[PDB]
Specification:
Three copies of one chain form a homotrimer. Chain A is mainly beta. Chain A has one domain. Chain A has strands at residues 12-14, 22-24, 35-42, 45-47, 52-56, 61-69, 75-78, 81-84, 87-96, 99-104, 106-109, 115-117, 121-123, 129-140, 161-171, 174-183, 186-189. In chain A, a hairpin with a 2-residue loop joins β7 (75-78) and β8. Chains A, B, C: This is Myelin regulatory factor, N-terminal. Chains A, B, C: It is found in: Nucleus; Cytoplasm.
Amino acid sequence: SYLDPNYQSIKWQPHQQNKWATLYDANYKELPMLTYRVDADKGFNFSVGDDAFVCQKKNHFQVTVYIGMLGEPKYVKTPEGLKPLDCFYLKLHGVKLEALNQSINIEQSQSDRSKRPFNPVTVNLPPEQVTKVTVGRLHFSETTANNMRKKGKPNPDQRYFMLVVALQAHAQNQNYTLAAQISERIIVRAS
Amino acid sequence: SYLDPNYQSIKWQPHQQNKWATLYDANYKELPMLTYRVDADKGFNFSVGDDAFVCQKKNHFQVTVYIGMLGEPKYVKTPEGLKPLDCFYLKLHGVKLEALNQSINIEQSQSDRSKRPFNPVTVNLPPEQVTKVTVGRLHFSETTANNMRKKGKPNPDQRYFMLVVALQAHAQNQNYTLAAQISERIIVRAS
Amino acid sequence: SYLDPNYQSIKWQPHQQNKWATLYDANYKELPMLTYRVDADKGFNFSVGDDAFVCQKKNHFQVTVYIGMLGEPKYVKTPEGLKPLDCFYLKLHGVKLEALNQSINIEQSQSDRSKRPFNPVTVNLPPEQVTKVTVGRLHFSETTANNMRKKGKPNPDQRYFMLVVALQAHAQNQNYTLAAQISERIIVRAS
Protein backbone atom coordinates (compact mmCIF):
# COMPACT_ATOMS: atom_id res chain seq x y z
CA SER A 1 0.00 0.00 0.00
CA TYR A 2 1.63 3.21 -1.29
CA LEU A 3 0.71 6.83 -0.59
CA ASP A 4 -0.06 9.31 -3.37
CA PRO A 5 3.24 11.04 -4.30
CA ASN A 6 1.37 14.23 -5.22
CA TYR A 7 0.67 14.58 -1.48
CA GLN A 8 3.40 12.58 0.28
CA SER A 9 6.96 13.61 -0.55
CA ILE A 10 10.35 13.16 1.06
CA LYS A 11 10.97 15.56 3.94
CA TRP A 12 14.30 17.31 4.33
CA GLN A 13 16.29 18.90 7.13
CA PRO A 14 19.39 21.15 7.19
CA HIS A 15 22.55 19.05 7.34
CA GLN A 16 25.67 20.10 9.33
CA GLN A 17 24.53 23.72 9.43
CA ASN A 18 27.23 24.66 11.98
CA LYS A 19 29.91 23.75 9.42
CA TRP A 20 28.73 25.86 6.48
CA ALA A 21 30.83 28.63 4.96
CA THR A 22 29.13 31.90 4.03
CA LEU A 23 29.13 34.23 1.04
CA TYR A 24 30.45 37.81 1.09
CA ASP A 25 29.98 40.62 -1.43
CA ALA A 26 32.51 42.93 -3.12
CA ASN A 27 32.40 45.29 -0.10
CA TYR A 28 33.48 42.46 2.23
CA LYS A 29 30.01 42.21 3.84
CA GLU A 30 28.23 38.91 4.55
CA LEU A 31 25.29 38.47 2.21
CA PRO A 32 21.82 37.65 3.52
CA MET A 33 21.70 33.87 3.55
CA LEU A 34 20.65 32.38 0.20
CA THR A 35 17.29 30.64 -0.04
CA TYR A 36 17.56 26.87 -0.48
CA ARG A 37 14.83 24.33 -1.13
CA VAL A 38 15.20 20.68 -2.22
CA ASP A 39 12.48 18.49 -3.71
CA ALA A 40 12.84 14.83 -4.68
CA ASP A 41 10.13 15.04 -7.29
CA LYS A 42 10.44 11.62 -9.00
CA GLY A 43 11.32 8.11 -7.97
CA PHE A 44 10.23 7.82 -4.32
CA ASN A 45 7.00 6.36 -2.93
CA PHE A 46 6.01 6.11 0.74
CA SER A 47 5.30 2.50 1.72
CA VAL A 48 2.80 2.35 4.59
CA GLY A 49 3.81 -1.19 5.52
CA ASP A 50 7.50 -0.28 5.77
CA ASP A 51 6.80 3.16 7.28
CA ALA A 52 9.39 4.61 4.88
CA PHE A 53 9.98 5.92 1.40
CA VAL A 54 10.96 3.23 -1.14
CA CYS A 55 12.63 3.43 -4.51
CA GLN A 56 13.71 0.83 -7.05
CA LYS A 57 17.43 0.90 -7.83
CA LYS A 58 16.83 0.64 -11.55
CA ASN A 59 14.05 3.28 -11.80
CA HIS A 60 15.68 6.65 -11.86
CA PHE A 61 14.93 9.41 -9.37
CA GLN A 62 15.10 13.16 -9.78
CA VAL A 63 15.93 16.04 -7.42
CA THR A 64 15.14 19.71 -8.08
CA VAL A 65 16.90 22.43 -6.09
CA TYR A 66 15.76 26.05 -5.85
CA ILE A 67 18.68 28.33 -4.96
CA GLY A 68 17.78 31.96 -4.28
CA MET A 69 20.94 34.09 -4.50
CA LEU A 70 20.50 37.31 -2.50
CA GLY A 71 23.05 39.92 -3.51
CA GLU A 72 26.16 39.42 -5.61
CA PRO A 73 28.67 36.98 -4.13
CA LYS A 74 32.40 37.54 -4.60
CA TYR A 75 34.06 35.76 -1.63
CA VAL A 76 33.60 32.67 0.54
CA LYS A 77 34.26 33.10 4.26
CA THR A 78 36.06 29.87 5.15
CA PRO A 79 37.61 28.75 8.44
CA GLU A 80 40.89 30.02 6.96
CA GLY A 81 39.31 33.41 6.19
CA LEU A 82 37.93 35.07 3.08
CA LYS A 83 38.74 33.56 -0.30
CA PRO A 84 37.76 34.68 -3.81
CA LEU A 85 34.94 32.61 -5.24
CA ASP A 86 35.68 30.48 -8.35
CA CYS A 87 32.42 28.61 -9.03
CA PHE A 88 29.52 26.76 -7.41
CA TYR A 89 28.89 22.99 -7.38
CA LEU A 90 25.77 20.98 -6.57
CA LYS A 91 26.77 17.67 -4.92
CA LEU A 92 24.48 14.70 -4.25
CA HIS A 93 25.36 11.50 -2.43
CA GLY A 94 23.83 8.91 -0.12
CA VAL A 95 24.87 7.95 3.38
CA LYS A 96 24.18 4.72 5.24
CA LEU A 97 21.73 5.29 8.10
CA GLU A 98 23.67 2.83 10.31
CA ALA A 99 27.06 4.16 9.20
CA LEU A 100 26.68 7.84 8.41
CA ASN A 101 30.40 8.16 7.62
CA GLN A 102 29.94 5.75 4.66
CA SER A 103 28.77 7.30 1.39
CA ILE A 104 26.67 5.68 -1.32
CA ASN A 105 27.71 6.90 -4.74
CA ILE A 106 24.99 8.17 -7.09
CA GLU A 107 25.04 7.25 -10.78
CA GLN A 108 23.31 8.94 -13.67
CA SER A 109 21.91 7.00 -16.61
CA GLN A 110 21.35 7.84 -20.27
CA SER A 111 18.73 6.57 -22.69
CA ASP A 112 21.13 3.89 -23.96
CA ARG A 113 21.16 2.65 -20.32
CA SER A 114 24.82 3.45 -19.83
CA LYS A 115 25.49 4.86 -16.36
CA ARG A 116 28.17 7.24 -15.16
CA PRO A 117 29.16 8.40 -11.68
CA PHE A 118 27.29 11.52 -10.78
CA ASN A 119 30.01 13.98 -9.82
CA PRO A 120 29.26 17.51 -8.58
CA VAL A 121 27.78 19.69 -11.30
CA THR A 122 28.74 23.30 -11.97
CA VAL A 123 25.85 25.69 -11.27
CA ASN A 124 25.74 29.32 -12.30
CA LEU A 125 23.97 31.45 -9.67
CA PRO A 126 23.36 34.94 -11.06
CA PRO A 127 22.68 37.62 -8.42
CA GLU A 128 19.20 38.44 -7.10
CA GLN A 129 17.61 35.38 -8.72
CA VAL A 130 16.38 31.93 -7.86
CA THR A 131 18.19 29.38 -10.02
CA LYS A 132 16.28 26.12 -10.46
CA VAL A 133 18.58 23.11 -10.89
CA THR A 134 17.02 19.82 -11.95
CA VAL A 135 19.12 16.66 -11.69
CA GLY A 136 17.41 13.67 -13.30
CA ARG A 137 18.00 10.05 -14.33
CA LEU A 138 19.66 9.28 -11.00
CA HIS A 139 20.26 5.94 -9.26
CA PHE A 140 21.79 4.79 -6.05
CA SER A 141 24.85 2.63 -6.74
CA GLU A 142 23.78 0.08 -4.04
CA THR A 143 20.62 -1.52 -2.67
CA THR A 144 19.88 -1.20 1.03
CA ALA A 145 20.70 -4.36 3.01
CA ASN A 146 18.09 -6.63 4.62
CA ASN A 147 15.16 -5.66 2.39
CA MET A 148 13.38 -9.03 2.50
CA ARG A 149 10.29 -9.24 4.66
CA LYS A 150 10.19 -11.63 7.63
CA LYS A 151 6.79 -13.06 8.65
CA GLY A 152 4.95 -10.46 6.59
CA LYS A 153 6.68 -7.81 8.72
CA PRO A 154 9.54 -5.43 7.89
CA ASN A 155 12.93 -7.05 8.28
CA PRO A 156 14.01 -6.11 11.83
CA ASP A 157 17.45 -5.32 10.41
CA GLN A 158 16.13 -3.31 7.42
CA ARG A 159 18.85 -0.84 6.41
CA TYR A 160 18.34 2.61 4.93
CA PHE A 161 20.03 5.40 3.00
CA MET A 162 19.63 9.15 3.45
CA LEU A 163 20.19 11.49 0.50
CA VAL A 164 22.43 14.54 0.95
CA VAL A 165 21.99 17.49 -1.48
CA ALA A 166 24.62 20.19 -0.93
CA LEU A 167 25.52 23.51 -2.56
CA GLN A 168 29.27 24.11 -2.44
CA ALA A 169 31.49 27.09 -3.20
CA HIS A 170 34.81 26.31 -4.88
CA ALA A 171 37.76 28.51 -3.86
CA GLN A 172 41.53 27.90 -4.23
CA ASN A 173 41.18 24.20 -5.18
CA GLN A 174 38.92 23.57 -2.17
CA ASN A 175 35.16 23.13 -1.83
CA TYR A 176 33.11 24.62 1.01
CA THR A 177 29.52 23.76 1.86
CA LEU A 178 27.15 26.75 1.76
CA ALA A 179 23.85 24.93 2.29
CA ALA A 180 22.93 21.28 2.59
CA GLN A 181 19.80 19.23 3.28
CA ILE A 182 19.52 15.55 4.20
CA SER A 183 16.44 13.43 3.52
CA GLU A 184 14.44 11.11 5.70
CA ARG A 185 15.37 7.43 5.46
CA ILE A 186 14.92 5.59 2.16
CA ILE A 187 14.71 1.89 1.23
CA VAL A 188 16.36 0.95 -2.09
CA ARG A 189 15.14 -2.35 -3.58
CA ALA A 190 16.49 -4.33 -6.53
CA SER A 191 13.34 -6.05 -7.78
CA SER B 1 -5.74 19.50 -12.27
CA TYR B 2 -5.48 20.99 -8.75
CA LEU B 3 -4.45 19.32 -5.51
CA ASP B 4 -6.67 19.33 -2.42
CA PRO B 5 -5.70 22.42 -0.34
CA ASN B 6 -6.59 20.59 2.88
CA TYR B 7 -3.53 18.42 2.19
CA GLN B 8 -1.27 20.51 -0.07
CA SER B 9 -0.27 23.90 1.32
CA ILE B 10 2.48 26.40 0.62
CA LYS B 11 5.80 25.45 2.19
CA TRP B 12 7.95 28.04 3.94
CA GLN B 13 11.60 28.49 4.82
CA PRO B 14 13.46 30.92 7.12
CA HIS B 15 14.46 34.05 5.21
CA GLN B 16 17.76 35.92 5.85
CA GLN B 17 18.17 34.28 9.25
CA ASN B 18 21.75 35.57 9.61
CA LYS B 19 20.44 39.15 9.54
CA TRP B 20 17.82 38.92 12.30
CA ALA B 21 17.99 40.99 15.47
CA THR B 22 17.18 39.31 18.79
CA LEU B 23 15.06 40.13 21.83
CA TYR B 24 16.46 40.75 25.32
CA ASP B 25 14.67 40.88 28.68
CA ALA B 26 14.76 43.48 31.48
CA ASN B 27 17.90 41.82 32.94
CA TYR B 28 19.77 42.31 29.64
CA LYS B 29 19.67 38.58 28.80
CA GLU B 30 18.81 37.20 25.35
CA LEU B 31 15.42 35.53 25.41
CA PRO B 32 14.92 32.00 24.10
CA MET B 33 14.06 32.47 20.45
CA LEU B 34 10.34 33.07 19.86
CA THR B 35 8.32 30.40 18.08
CA TYR B 36 7.21 31.41 14.58
CA ARG B 37 4.93 29.58 12.18
CA VAL B 38 3.32 30.92 8.98
CA ASP B 39 0.37 29.39 7.12
CA ALA B 40 -1.15 30.67 3.88
CA ASP B 41 -4.54 29.22 4.65
CA LYS B 42 -6.66 30.70 1.83
CA GLY B 43 -6.17 31.63 -1.79
CA PHE B 44 -3.49 29.25 -3.10
CA ASN B 45 -3.95 26.01 -5.02
CA PHE B 46 -1.20 23.70 -6.30
CA SER B 47 -1.44 23.22 -10.06
CA VAL B 48 0.00 19.86 -11.10
CA GLY B 49 0.46 20.95 -14.71
CA ASP B 50 2.43 24.05 -13.71
CA ASP B 51 4.23 22.28 -10.84
CA ALA B 52 3.54 25.35 -8.68
CA PHE B 53 1.01 27.06 -6.46
CA VAL B 54 -1.40 29.37 -8.32
CA CYS B 55 -3.61 32.18 -7.15
CA GLN B 56 -5.97 34.57 -8.92
CA LYS B 57 -5.06 38.24 -8.47
CA LYS B 58 -8.64 39.21 -7.76
CA ASN B 59 -9.46 36.38 -5.28
CA HIS B 60 -8.07 37.35 -1.94
CA PHE B 61 -5.59 35.26 0.01
CA GLN B 62 -5.05 34.99 3.75
CA VAL B 63 -1.98 34.36 5.93
CA THR B 64 -2.08 33.33 9.60
CA VAL B 65 1.02 33.71 11.77
CA TYR B 66 1.55 32.03 15.14
CA ILE B 67 4.07 33.96 17.24
CA GLY B 68 5.10 32.31 20.50
CA MET B 69 6.71 34.93 22.77
CA LEU B 70 8.99 33.24 25.31
CA GLY B 71 9.76 35.54 28.22
CA GLU B 72 9.12 39.27 28.46
CA PRO B 73 10.94 41.33 25.83
CA LYS B 74 12.23 44.80 26.68
CA TYR B 75 15.14 45.41 24.26
CA VAL B 76 16.17 44.62 20.68
CA LYS B 77 19.81 43.68 20.14
CA THR B 78 20.64 45.46 16.87
CA PRO B 79 23.93 45.73 15.00
CA GLU B 80 24.31 49.09 16.78
CA GLY B 81 23.71 47.44 20.17
CA LEU B 82 20.76 47.15 22.53
CA LYS B 83 17.80 49.47 22.01
CA PRO B 84 14.55 49.79 23.97
CA LEU B 85 11.64 48.13 22.22
CA ASP B 86 8.75 50.35 21.04
CA CYS B 87 6.35 47.96 19.27
CA PHE B 88 6.14 44.99 16.91
CA TYR B 89 5.07 44.99 13.24
CA LEU B 90 4.02 42.16 10.93
CA LYS B 91 5.16 42.93 7.36
CA LEU B 92 4.12 41.05 4.21
CA HIS B 93 5.39 41.63 0.69
CA GLY B 94 6.19 39.73 -2.49
CA VAL B 95 9.49 39.44 -4.30
CA LYS B 96 10.12 38.58 -7.94
CA LEU B 97 11.73 35.15 -8.28
CA GLU B 98 13.94 36.41 -11.14
CA ALA B 99 14.69 39.71 -9.39
CA LEU B 100 14.65 39.11 -5.66
CA ASN B 101 15.60 42.73 -4.96
CA GLN B 102 12.27 43.87 -6.51
CA SER B 103 9.25 43.86 -4.21
CA ILE B 104 5.62 43.28 -5.15
CA ASN B 105 3.32 45.39 -3.01
CA ILE B 106 0.39 43.65 -1.29
CA GLU B 107 -3.03 45.31 -1.19
CA GLN B 108 -5.94 44.62 1.12
CA SER B 109 -9.54 44.81 -0.03
CA GLN B 110 -12.80 45.63 1.72
CA SER B 111 -16.32 44.41 1.02
CA ASP B 112 -17.02 47.50 -1.11
CA ARG B 113 -14.08 46.28 -3.26
CA SER B 114 -11.92 49.27 -2.45
CA LYS B 115 -8.28 48.29 -1.99
CA ARG B 116 -5.56 49.87 0.12
CA PRO B 117 -1.83 49.21 0.36
CA PHE B 118 -1.14 46.67 3.03
CA ASN B 119 1.40 48.38 5.28
CA PRO B 120 2.95 46.65 8.31
CA VAL B 121 0.42 46.05 11.05
CA THR B 122 1.04 46.62 14.76
CA VAL B 123 0.96 43.36 16.73
CA ASN B 124 0.82 43.10 20.49
CA LEU B 125 2.86 40.12 21.76
CA PRO B 126 2.15 39.58 25.46
CA PRO B 127 4.78 37.51 27.30
CA GLU B 128 4.66 33.71 27.56
CA GLN B 129 1.88 33.38 24.97
CA VAL B 130 1.35 32.47 21.36
CA THR B 131 -0.36 35.36 19.57
CA LYS B 132 -2.26 34.31 16.45
CA VAL B 133 -2.34 37.03 13.79
CA THR B 134 -4.67 36.55 10.83
CA VAL B 135 -4.25 38.84 7.82
CA GLY B 136 -7.05 38.40 5.29
CA ARG B 137 -8.51 39.90 2.11
CA LEU B 138 -5.05 40.20 0.55
CA HIS B 139 -4.01 40.58 -3.10
CA PHE B 140 -0.80 40.88 -4.98
CA SER B 141 -0.59 44.25 -6.72
CA GLU B 142 0.76 42.61 -9.95
CA THR B 143 0.28 39.46 -12.01
CA THR B 144 3.29 37.28 -12.73
CA ALA B 145 4.68 37.72 -16.25
CA ASN B 146 4.48 35.09 -19.00
CA ASN B 147 1.51 33.16 -17.62
CA MET B 148 0.10 32.03 -20.97
CA ARG B 149 0.65 28.41 -21.91
CA LYS B 150 2.69 27.52 -25.00
CA LYS B 151 1.83 24.26 -26.82
CA GLY B 152 -0.18 23.00 -23.86
CA LYS B 153 3.01 23.31 -21.79
CA PRO B 154 4.01 25.87 -19.14
CA ASN B 155 5.43 29.02 -20.63
CA PRO B 156 9.21 28.45 -20.63
CA ASP B 157 9.60 32.01 -19.31
CA GLN B 158 6.86 31.68 -16.64
CA ARG B 159 7.66 34.16 -13.87
CA TYR B 160 6.91 33.75 -10.17
CA PHE B 161 6.55 35.60 -6.90
CA MET B 162 7.60 34.48 -3.42
CA LEU B 163 5.77 35.79 -0.36
CA VAL B 164 7.79 37.17 2.57
CA VAL B 165 6.13 37.27 6.03
CA ALA B 166 8.32 39.01 8.61
CA LEU B 167 8.00 39.95 12.29
CA GLN B 168 9.82 43.21 13.02
CA ALA B 169 10.76 45.05 16.21
CA HIS B 170 10.51 48.85 16.06
CA ALA B 171 13.14 50.77 18.05
CA GLN B 172 14.26 54.42 17.75
CA ASN B 173 12.47 55.06 14.42
CA GLN B 174 14.01 51.92 12.90
CA ASN B 175 12.63 48.45 12.20
CA TYR B 176 14.58 45.24 12.78
CA THR B 177 13.62 41.79 11.56
CA LEU B 178 13.20 39.22 14.34
CA ALA B 179 11.88 36.31 12.28
CA ALA B 180 10.94 35.92 8.64
CA GLN B 181 9.77 33.13 6.34
CA ILE B 182 9.65 33.09 2.53
CA SER B 183 7.27 30.90 0.52
CA GLU B 184 7.83 28.59 -2.39
CA ARG B 185 7.20 30.10 -5.82
CA ILE B 186 3.70 31.28 -6.73
CA ILE B 187 1.97 32.04 -10.06
CA VAL B 188 -0.46 34.99 -10.00
CA ARG B 189 -3.02 34.99 -12.83
CA ALA B 190 -5.48 37.69 -13.89
CA SER B 191 -8.28 35.60 -15.37
CA SER C 1 -14.63 16.12 9.49
CA TYR C 2 -11.09 14.74 9.99
CA LEU C 3 -8.18 14.65 7.57
CA ASP C 4 -6.39 11.41 6.65
CA PRO C 5 -3.48 10.99 9.12
CA ASN C 6 -1.42 9.19 6.45
CA TYR C 7 -1.22 12.58 4.70
CA GLN C 8 -1.79 15.19 7.43
CA SER C 9 0.60 15.02 10.37
CA ILE C 10 1.71 17.39 13.09
CA LYS C 11 4.28 19.92 11.93
CA TRP C 12 7.29 20.77 14.06
CA GLN C 13 9.71 23.66 14.43
CA PRO C 14 13.06 24.06 16.25
CA HIS C 15 12.50 25.23 19.82
CA GLN C 16 14.86 27.67 21.61
CA GLN C 17 17.67 26.95 19.15
CA ASN C 18 19.78 29.85 20.47
CA LYS C 19 19.96 28.14 23.87
CA TRP C 20 21.23 24.71 22.78
CA ALA C 21 24.55 23.28 23.94
CA THR C 22 26.75 21.50 21.40
CA LEU C 23 28.71 18.26 21.28
CA TYR C 24 32.50 18.04 21.01
CA ASP C 25 34.73 15.07 20.15
CA ALA C 26 37.81 13.65 21.92
CA ASN C 27 40.04 16.16 20.08
CA TYR C 28 38.05 19.09 21.52
CA LYS C 29 36.44 19.91 18.15
CA GLU C 30 32.74 20.71 17.70
CA LEU C 31 30.98 17.87 15.91
CA PRO C 32 28.84 18.49 12.83
CA MET C 33 25.37 19.08 14.22
CA LEU C 34 23.41 15.86 14.77
CA THR C 35 20.40 15.15 12.58
CA TYR C 36 17.09 15.37 14.43
CA ARG C 37 13.60 14.54 13.20
CA VAL C 38 10.41 14.14 15.26
CA ASP C 39 7.20 12.45 14.13
CA ALA C 40 3.98 12.16 16.16
CA ASP C 41 2.91 9.01 14.39
CA LYS C 42 -0.14 7.97 16.47
CA GLY C 43 -2.90 9.70 18.35
CA PHE C 44 -3.45 13.01 16.54
CA ASN C 45 -6.06 13.86 13.91
CA PHE C 46 -6.52 17.21 12.16
CA SER C 47 -10.04 18.57 12.69
CA VAL C 48 -11.09 20.80 9.80
CA GLY C 49 -13.83 22.47 11.83
CA ASP C 50 -11.43 23.38 14.65
CA ASP C 51 -8.54 24.14 12.27
CA ALA C 52 -6.25 22.19 14.62
CA PHE C 53 -4.99 18.76 15.55
CA VAL C 54 -7.13 16.95 18.15
CA CYS C 55 -6.41 14.05 20.43
CA GLN C 56 -8.43 12.24 23.09
CA LYS C 57 -6.84 12.32 26.54
CA LYS C 58 -7.51 8.64 27.11
CA ASN C 59 -6.30 7.37 23.69
CA HIS C 60 -2.57 7.15 23.80
CA PHE C 61 -0.27 8.95 21.38
CA GLN C 62 3.18 8.01 20.16
CA VAL C 63 6.26 10.02 19.13
CA THR C 64 9.21 8.64 17.15
CA VAL C 65 12.51 10.52 17.09
CA TYR C 66 15.32 9.93 14.59
CA ILE C 67 18.66 11.09 16.02
CA GLY C 68 21.60 10.98 13.62
CA MET C 69 24.85 11.13 15.60
CA LEU C 70 27.68 12.45 13.42
CA GLY C 71 31.07 11.65 14.89
CA GLU C 72 31.83 10.39 18.39
CA PRO C 73 30.75 12.76 21.16
CA LYS C 74 32.81 13.05 24.34
CA TYR C 75 32.04 16.54 25.71
CA VAL C 76 29.16 19.01 25.96
CA LYS C 77 30.02 22.67 25.38
CA THR C 78 27.89 24.43 28.00
CA PRO C 79 27.69 28.12 28.92
CA GLU C 80 30.16 27.22 31.70
CA GLY C 81 32.52 25.61 29.18
CA LEU C 82 33.28 22.04 28.13
CA LYS C 83 32.09 19.21 30.35
CA PRO C 84 32.52 15.44 29.98
CA LEU C 85 29.38 13.76 28.70
CA ASP C 86 27.62 11.26 31.01
CA CYS C 87 24.52 10.17 29.07
CA PHE C 88 21.69 11.37 26.83
CA TYR C 89 18.02 11.85 27.75
CA LEU C 90 14.92 12.25 25.59
CA LYS C 91 12.43 14.58 27.34
CA LEU C 92 8.81 15.18 26.32
CA HIS C 93 6.38 17.62 27.88
CA GLY C 94 3.50 19.90 26.94
CA VAL C 95 3.23 23.66 27.30
CA LYS C 96 0.11 25.80 27.47
CA LEU C 97 -0.27 27.92 24.34
CA GLU C 98 -1.56 30.86 26.43
CA ALA C 99 1.02 30.33 29.17
CA LEU C 100 4.15 28.91 27.60
CA ASN C 101 5.97 28.93 30.95
CA GLN C 102 3.45 26.35 32.29
CA SER C 103 4.20 22.71 31.52
CA ILE C 104 1.71 19.89 31.04
CA ASN C 105 3.08 16.63 32.38
CA ILE C 106 2.98 13.57 30.11
CA GLU C 107 1.99 10.18 31.50
CA GLN C 108 2.64 6.74 30.08
CA SER C 109 0.15 3.90 30.40
CA GLN C 110 0.49 0.13 30.56
CA SER C 111 -1.89 -2.59 29.40
CA ASP C 112 -3.36 -2.86 32.91
CA ARG C 113 -4.29 0.84 32.46
CA SER C 114 -2.00 2.01 35.22
CA LYS C 115 -0.27 5.28 34.33
CA ARG C 116 3.08 6.66 35.42
CA PRO C 117 4.72 10.04 34.91
CA PHE C 118 6.80 10.01 31.79
CA ASN C 119 10.22 11.15 32.95
CA PRO C 120 13.16 11.63 30.56
CA VAL C 121 14.37 8.34 29.13
CA THR C 122 18.02 7.35 28.72
CA VAL C 123 18.99 7.01 25.06
CA ASN C 124 22.18 5.43 23.79
CA LEU C 125 23.49 7.24 20.69
CA PRO C 126 26.32 5.22 19.14
CA PRO C 127 28.59 7.19 16.79
CA GLU C 128 27.92 7.57 13.06
CA GLN C 129 24.40 6.13 13.29
CA VAL C 130 20.81 7.22 13.35
CA THR C 131 19.15 5.94 16.53
CA LYS C 132 15.38 5.60 16.25
CA VAL C 133 13.61 6.17 19.58
CA THR C 134 9.91 5.31 19.80
CA VAL C 135 7.96 6.52 22.82
CA GLY C 136 4.45 5.06 22.93
CA ARG C 137 1.37 4.76 25.15
CA LEU C 138 1.53 8.45 26.03
CA HIS C 139 -1.15 10.78 27.42
CA PHE C 140 -1.39 14.39 28.36
CA SER C 141 -2.08 14.74 32.08
CA GLU C 142 -4.71 17.49 31.43
CA THR C 143 -7.43 18.36 28.92
CA THR C 144 -7.27 21.71 27.17
CA ALA C 145 -9.68 24.29 28.60
CA ASN C 146 -12.76 25.61 26.78
CA ASN C 147 -13.23 22.67 24.41
CA MET C 148 -17.03 22.90 24.16
CA ARG C 149 -18.42 24.33 20.95
CA LYS C 150 -20.47 27.54 21.02
CA LYS C 151 -23.16 27.99 18.32
CA GLY C 152 -21.68 25.19 16.22
CA LYS C 153 -18.45 27.21 16.12
CA PRO C 154 -15.13 26.68 17.92
CA ASN C 155 -15.14 28.06 21.43
CA PRO C 156 -13.67 31.57 21.07
CA ASP C 157 -11.56 30.84 24.16
CA GLN C 158 -10.44 27.36 23.00
CA ARG C 159 -7.11 26.60 24.68
CA TYR C 160 -4.27 24.53 23.26
CA PHE C 161 -1.14 22.62 24.16
CA MET C 162 2.11 22.37 22.20
CA LEU C 163 4.32 19.29 22.56
CA VAL C 164 8.05 19.75 23.20
CA VAL C 165 10.42 16.86 22.30
CA ALA C 166 14.00 17.55 23.39
CA LEU C 167 17.31 15.66 23.30
CA GLN C 168 19.44 16.51 26.33
CA ALA C 169 23.04 15.82 27.30
CA HIS C 170 23.65 15.06 30.98
CA ALA C 171 26.94 16.35 32.43
CA GLN C 172 27.95 16.92 36.08
CA ASN C 173 24.42 16.51 37.49
CA GLN C 174 23.03 19.00 34.95
CA ASN C 175 21.07 18.56 31.73
CA TYR C 176 21.69 20.61 28.58
CA THR C 177 19.44 20.76 25.54
CA LEU C 178 21.14 19.68 22.30
CA ALA C 179 18.12 19.74 19.98
CA ALA C 180 14.44 20.39 20.54
CA GLN C 181 11.30 20.68 18.41
CA ILE C 182 7.90 22.08 19.37
CA SER C 183 4.64 21.06 17.69
CA GLU C 184 1.80 23.08 16.27
CA ARG C 185 -1.14 23.64 18.61
CA ILE C 186 -3.16 20.64 19.82
CA ILE C 187 -6.65 20.28 21.35
CA VAL C 188 -6.96 17.59 24.05
CA ARG C 189 -10.53 16.40 24.68
CA ALA C 190 -11.90 14.17 27.44
CA SER C 191 -14.85 12.54 25.68
